[model samples]
Target chain A: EVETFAFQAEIAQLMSLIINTFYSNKEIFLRELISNSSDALDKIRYESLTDPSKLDSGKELHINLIPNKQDRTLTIVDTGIGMTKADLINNLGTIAKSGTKAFMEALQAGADISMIGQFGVGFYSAYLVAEKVTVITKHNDDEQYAWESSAGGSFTVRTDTGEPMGRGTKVILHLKEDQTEYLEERRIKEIVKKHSQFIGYPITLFVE
Target chain B: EVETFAFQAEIAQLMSLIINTFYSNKEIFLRELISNSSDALDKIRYESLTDPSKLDSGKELHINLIPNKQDRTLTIVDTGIGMTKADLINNLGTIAKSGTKAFMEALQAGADISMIGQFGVGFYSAYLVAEKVTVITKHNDDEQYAWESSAGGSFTVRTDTGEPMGRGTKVILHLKEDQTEYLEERRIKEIVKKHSQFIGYPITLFVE
Candidate 1:
C-alpha cells in the first residue's frame, strides 16, 4: 500500500517537453505504448529462458487495444512481464535505467526493434491525448497493483482488489476532450499499422 | 582533461526510443536547436530582470542559424545564457535535467512555444542527420568550454580555443552524407516557418 507520490521534479520538466511533443505528434502515443508492450513480452520471454519456472504458463504474450468512445477511454492491455511496486515507481518515475539499455543494444544490433520497448520518460507522451492514465499490472512476484495518474504532477500506486490478472500489464488512457478521432477503430488501426505493422506479438483491437 | 565515459547502460534504451523519434521527424533537429536558443535568450532576460547585474550587459541576446557549405556545418548561436563544465557534462552526457523542465513548463503555459528552446534529450535528435556535434559555450560563473561528440556513446569537454562568443552558446552539426538536403537554404527556411515561424528569435540561413 504505497502512497501517491510526486514525480521527481525532473519529471515535471520532462512532462512539459512531452506535452508539446505529444500534442503535435498525438498519434505517437499508440506506437510508444505498443512498443513498451513488446518490450515487456521480450523481457518475460528472456527471463523464462534461464528459469523456465519464471514464465507465465497460464497466458500467451499479446497486446490488446480497446477504445470506449462513450467513456472516452482507450485501454492497452498486454500479457507481458508486469511490474512490481518498486518497478512501477522506478521505471515510470525516473529517466534512463540500465536494464533498458541492454535490451535496446540487442535490439539495435539485431536490426529489428522487436526487443527495444523501454518506455523511458517518453511515456509521458501518453498525456498528450489522455487526461488520465491508468496501469494495472500483475507480475509473477507481486500480486496485482494499479498505478494511475492524470499527468498533473503525481501518481498513485496501490494494491488491486479486482480479479488478479492471470498475468501481464494493462494501461487505460482516458482520452482528452477533442480527441474523438482516436476512439474510431479504423483510425487507431491505421496508427498501429503505421507504427507497428507487424508487431512481434499478436494484437487485437476492440472499439465500443 | 577527461576521457569520454560510456553512458549508463540505460541511455541505450533512451537511444532506442529517441532514435526512432529522430529518424521519423528529421526536420525536428532545426526546431529543437532553435527552441533551445529561445530558451537561452529567455533565461538571460529573466536573469537580467532579477539582478540588473546578473547578466552580462555587453551581450545582446539573440538566436542565429547559420549554414556553412565550406565547413559542411549548420551552426546555431545564442547570445544568451551559456554553460559551465559541469553543465556541459551533466546536461549533454546524462538524461533529462532541470533546465529543460523549466523551459517546457513555461512553454506549455504560454500556449505559444515561441518561448520553448530547451531540447533536453531531444538535443540528441541531431545525431539522426549529423555525424558530429560541437558545442562551445561560456557562462559568467565559469570559463568557456567545448563539448563535442560523434553520437557514438561518450563526449569530450575541454577549454575552448575558438573566437569568444562573449556570452551564450553555439552548436555546430556536421550533416550526414545523405542529409545534405538539410543545407538547402530554401528548404530550411520552409521548415523554420512551418515549425517555428513565429519563434521569439531572429534566424537566417545564408544561401550564399
Candidate 2:
C-alpha cells in the first residue's frame, strides 16, 4: 500500500455539516474533495520521514484531476495514506456527521445515509451529481482494492489486480443526468482551484 | 509496514512530484487522519442511501482512541469504509501525487519514492512521532487483517484469524521518544479537535 491522499477527521464532516446546516452550495463538492486530497498528501510526506530509505525525500503531494467524458466520469487522485479492507467497512458502514457539538447533535437526530458525503462530506459529494462513485485505493499495510457504490449502503470491494499502484487514492465519479455539466474541464478546474487554493498542496486537473 | 495509509498513481514519480511542491507542519498528521477518518465516515453514510435495509442508520461514524502506555502506542479506530488484502499492498508500495501541471513542471527538479494518499495525507504525518507504525484493518467483504510496519517500505499483512473486529480500521502508532507527548489524552484530543471542531461527526477521543 503506497498511502497517499485521504483526509477525513476534520473537514469532510465539517464541510458536510456546514453545508447541511447552512448552505446548499453544490460547488463545495470540489472543495470537499480537494480538502480531502490536501489532507492526504500531508500524511504521505510525513510518512516519507519514517520510510528511512526515502527519509531525505522531499514531498509527493499533488492533486490530479482526470475527467473521462466517454465514461461520464471525473477522477481525483491523491498521493497520501490509503485505507485497508477493514477501513472500508468501518468508515463506509456508518454515516458521517458534523463533528461540532451543535452540528453533530442535530445530525444525530435526523441522520441517515444520503446526508453523508454532503457538499464536502468525504465521498458523499459524488451523489450530488453522479449516480455511482468508485474508489480505487492502495493501502500501505494492505493491497490495492476498489470500492464502488451508487450512493447506497451496500458497496462492493474487490481486489485491484491492476498493475501495482503507488500510495494514495483514485476517486472516479460517474456523472448523473443533471450533473453532466461538471464534465467541462474548465468548470472542474475552476471549482477545484477556487476551494482548493488554500490547502498547501497543488490541485491539478488531469487533462487526459 | 502498514500499507493501508498509502495511495498513489505513478508511485515514485507521483510521490516526488507532490513533495517538490509542498512543505509540512507535522502536527497536521493527526489532523490529517481526522480528516481522512471523517471522510471515510462520510462515504459510509452516503452508501446507506443506496440500500434501504441499512438506511436510517445513525452515527455509524465514530472515531475512537486507545493508547497503550506500556507499549508506547496510540490506537485510532474508525468504523467506516474498509479495504482488502490487495488494497493494502498496492497502496503501501507506491506514492501518490496530483497529476497536474505545476506538478510535472516542478518535478523536473526533484522527486522521491514515498508520499501518497490524497484524502488522508496527514495519516503519514504520524511518522513525525512514531518509529514503528502498525495498521490493523478489516474489510466488510472479507476477514480481518492485521498489518504492522517499521514505518518504512516493507510492510507485512496477515489474517487476524484471532478475533472478529468491529469492522473498521485500527491505526496503532508506536510513538517515538520525542512523540510521547501525543500519548496524553488531553494533548492528542486538543490537537485533533483544533481542526476538527467544525464537523458533524462525533469525534470523541477514545480514552481506553
Candidate 3:
C-alpha cells in the first residue's frame, strides 16, 4: 500500500525549463527515454548476477513504442525496474545529483546534448512534444500509481484503480497539433534509429 | 618579388562578421594571437626535423609582447620561421586552406573562439582590437618584407625598408583608444598565462 507523493517546487521549475527552453530538438525525446530504459535493464541484469531471485521476473528488457494516429497519442512502454511513489517523486521532481547540476550548467553554458548526456534533466524532455504526460508505473514491492502532468507549473498524482500490468512502466504523451510528427510510425522509427541505435536494448514499434 | 592580393569578397564579409558578430568576448584576442605563434613554431619545428636547412639561423622559438603607453601600441613578436613576401600574400590575402573556410563558417554560424578555436583564422583575430596592423618579417631564405592592413577592406605588402631584426617576424598593432587595455604589461602577462600556458615555448613581455 504505497501512497503517491507530490512533486517538489524545484522539480516543477525544472520541468518548465525542459519543456520551454532546454530542448531545441524535440526528436531527441524518444532516444533519451529509450536510453534510460536500457540503463535500467543493465542495472537489473547486473543485480541478477548476485541475487538469483532478481532474475525471477518474467518480463524481458525491451522498449515498445505505440503510436495512435486517431488520438494523436504516442505511448512508450519500458519493461524495466519500475518506480515506487518515493522513487517517482525523487527521480522526477528534483536535481538530486551533482551530475544533474553539472548538466544543467553545461546546458546554460550552451553545450549541445549530442556532445554531452546529462541524464537527470533528460527525463523531463518528454514535455517537449507532449501537451499532457501520463506515467503509469507498477513496482515489484508497491501498488500501481499514476503520475500526470501538463508541465504547466503544477501536476497531480493519484492512485491507480485500473487493472495493472504485473510490472514495468508506461508513458502516454498527448501530442499537440504541432507535434503530430511523433504520431507517424516512420518518423518515430527513424528518430529511434538515428539516436538510439547503439542503446544496447531491443525497441519495437506498434503503429495503426 | 612578392605581390599583394585582394581578399575574396566572401572572406572580407566573413572577417567583418568574425570581429563584430562572432566574438562576444574581446579578451580572446590574446589567445588567438598566442595560438598563431604556437602554430608558427610547430610548423618550423616539424620542418626542421626533416629539412634542417629550413630553420632560421640563430633564431629561437620565442614570443615577445611590447607595449607602449604613450603611443597606445602593442607589438607581438615571434622568433619562429618568418614568412617570405609570397607566403605573406598567399596566406594572409587569400583563403588558402579548407580550415579557413570551416573557421569562417563557424563564425558565420555565431560561434565564439573561446568555446572552439578556429585554428586557421587565429591570425586574423588581431583585427578585433587593433585599428591598424603591420607585420615585418624576414624568411630563412628571402629578404625582409612588410605587410600592412587597416582591416577596412584592403592590405598592402612591400619590401622592408626599416632595420631588420636578424630573423623571424614582428607584428605591431596600432591599438584603438578603447583597446588601450592591451598596452598594460600585467594584463598581457595574465592573458598569455591563461591562454598559452601549454604552448611549449617561452613568452616574454617587454614593458616600458
| Highest-TM-score candidate | 2
Name the runs in model 1 displaced over 4 angstroms.
A20-23, A96-119, B1-208
For residue A152, what is the lDDT in candidate 2? Answer: 26
TM-score for each prediction?
A: 0.46, 0.49, 0.48
> Which of the two, 1 or 2, has more DockQ?
2
Q: Candidate 3 A-chain TM?
A: 0.86
User: What would the per-residue lDDT of candidate 3 be over residues A151-196, giving only the tens digit for each residue?
Assistant: 7656666778887766678888899789898988789888986776
Cα lDDT computed for each candidate against the true fold: 0.68, 0.60, 0.69
Candidate 3 Cα outliers beyond 4 Å, as residue runs = A1-208, B1-5, B22-24, B53-56, B91-97, B108-110, B113-116
Instruction: Place model 2 in a CAPRI quality band.
Output: incorrect
Docking class of 1: incorrect
lDDT of 2 by residue, A1-208 (tens): 3323333454344434433444345665666676667666655664564464432322466778888878888888887676667667554333332333343554667653333433234456555666777888876767788887653234577878886657678888887777776878888768765655445566776675
True contacts kept of each: 0.00, 0.15, 0.00
Q: Who is ahead in DockQ, 2 or 3?
A: 2
| 1 versus 2: better TM-score goes to | 2
User: Which consecutive 10 residues in model 3 chain B have the weakest lDDT in total?
Assistant: B91-100
Per-candidate DockQ vs. reference: 0.02, 0.09, 0.01
Which candidate achieves the best DockQ against the true structure?
2
Model 2, residue A173: what's the lDDT? Answer: 81
